[PDB]
Automatic annotation (TrEMBL), chains A, B, C:
Bc2l-C N-terminal domain: residues covered: 15-129
Official protein name in the record: Lectin
Residues of the full protein shown: 1 to 132 of 272
Species of provenance: Burkholderia cenocepacia (strain ATCC BAA-245 / DSM 16553 / LMG 16656 / NCTC 13227 / J2315 / CF5610) (Burkholderia cepacia (strain J2315))
Length: 134, 134, 134
């Protein structure tokens, strides 16, 4: 159609620790397949129910990446060194990409805060709305 | 218009406890009334300042529902069994619905984590952007 | 173009305390410049990695404002009087503005919860998608 909305969603990912960004499997939008080659994409990475396990102020970094690498990043962290319980910390990240540059895909990634294990066990999404410059 | 944006917003809701999803009153989009019958809707449920009261790791589940039921859901929870103070835990949930299936409305819902009372006493919104497949 | 997306992003702001909303420098969209004069804007304020310092349940209020003042606001706050460590508390706020009113700009603002110092030291964005009424 003339006003493309892209969406991918997951309900889980294998629990891993990583010092550097690794893909969140399944949060991937094939932009080239959509025939988006010019304009802008507003991309939302929505991880509403994550938690992190660890023993030194745990948390998770998340990123929106294209084939050109990370475009935006943010994290949550707990406020106790060893939380009584690793509570659910909703996380949203929003970035606008110029597709002209040579973007063929957008994806979600994550990485450990201070050696934390990274947990998704319910709904998470990666969404993009296509538009133009003003 | 040719590029509809739907929006509903509230500033409060009666405080309730519920084991199962109940509507957040006022967070409701009448899609049929808009004449949306085909394409996709990106729906954001934005509850930026909620809190939960309770005695067993309190929190709130939130959902986006259509007439076909829940499409996505997430929660926040505290990281203490009995928080010193029930702090404000911003919550965002994003989902993309294919409208063809027979969607006439989109709404926000909530339900208790472990018997928590659910509090909204400031701005919350439900938004939707209409588009098409790629 | 015929389907504008507006975007502004920062990576930091001078740390300040403020009893009333002050601008988050750099989170500002010039809507008049875009030639948006009618329809709707869905505006997201995305502050994914903030923290607050203070000694009385710290937190930050955030707002979306136009030339007509604040349209929506929300806050995060910690659940301890003096957090062990001021953890990162992702914050998103979404609002839909009718541009006809006389809107020339949209901006993000913030203010202190109970005298908190307000910290941004990584990516934050302010985004807007243009549409029409249904
Ligand atoms: C609240 C929580 O984290 N629940 C976890 C649980 O954590 C337990 C520890 O916090 C523990 C230390 O003793 O105290 C509690 O458990 C005690 C007791 O030990 C237990 O035997 C007894 O039956 O209950 C008491 C209550 O005080 C904590 O509850 O760890 C286990 C790991 O085995 C689970 O992850 C549990 O997580 C929950 O599991 C549920 C199924 O029983 C269900 O799926 C819940 O949704 C899930 O909780 C959610 O995820 C958690 C990681 C957390 O984020 C919570 O806020 C979420 O609601
Ligand atoms: C977790 C944290 O807050 N890290 C801050 C750090 O805070 C230290 C203090 O909080 C301290 C008590 O006041 O506890 C720890 O430090 C102890 C000890 O006191 C210290 O001397 C020793 O080296 O380590 C131990 C560990 O128990 C806290 O670590 O203060 C420093 C210096 O001022 C930093 O801000 C640190 O922030 C981290 O800094 C990193 C760069 O070195 C990096 O940039 C991290 O991203 C950043 O942490 C993040 O921001 C924090 C403010 C907090 O939000 C954390 O959750 C984030 O991950
Ligand atoms: C810090 C807080 O929660 N204040 C909140 C207070 O909570 C206390 C708690 O601090 C501690 O001492 O334990 C006792 C008993 O458990 C209380 O729970 O209770 C007060 C009395 O009802 C209020 O609820 C107070 O809430 C604040 O009230 C002021 C005006 O009185 C403003 O309206 C604040 O905005 C409001 O704080 C906001 O909501 C509270 C629930 C919390 O989310 C704060 O982080 C938040 O800023």
């Amino acid at each position: 159609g003339h006003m493309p909305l892209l969406s991918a969603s997951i309900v889980s990912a294998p629990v891993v620790t990583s010092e550097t960004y690794v893909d969140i499997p399944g949060l991937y939008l094939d932009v080239a397949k959509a025939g988006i080659r010019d304009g802008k994409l507003q991309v939302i990475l929505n991880v509403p129910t994550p938690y992190a396990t660890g023993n030194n102020f745990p948390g998770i970094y998340f990123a929106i990446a294209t084939n050109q690498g990370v475009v935006a990043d943010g994290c949550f962290t707990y406020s106790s060194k060893v939380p009584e319980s690793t509570g659910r910390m909703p996380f949203t990240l929003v970035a606008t990409i110029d597709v002209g540059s040579g973007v063929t895909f957008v994806k979600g990634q994550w990485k450990s805060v201070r050696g934390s294990a990274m947990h998704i066990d319910s709904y998470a999404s990666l969404s993009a709305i296509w538009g133009t410059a003003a």
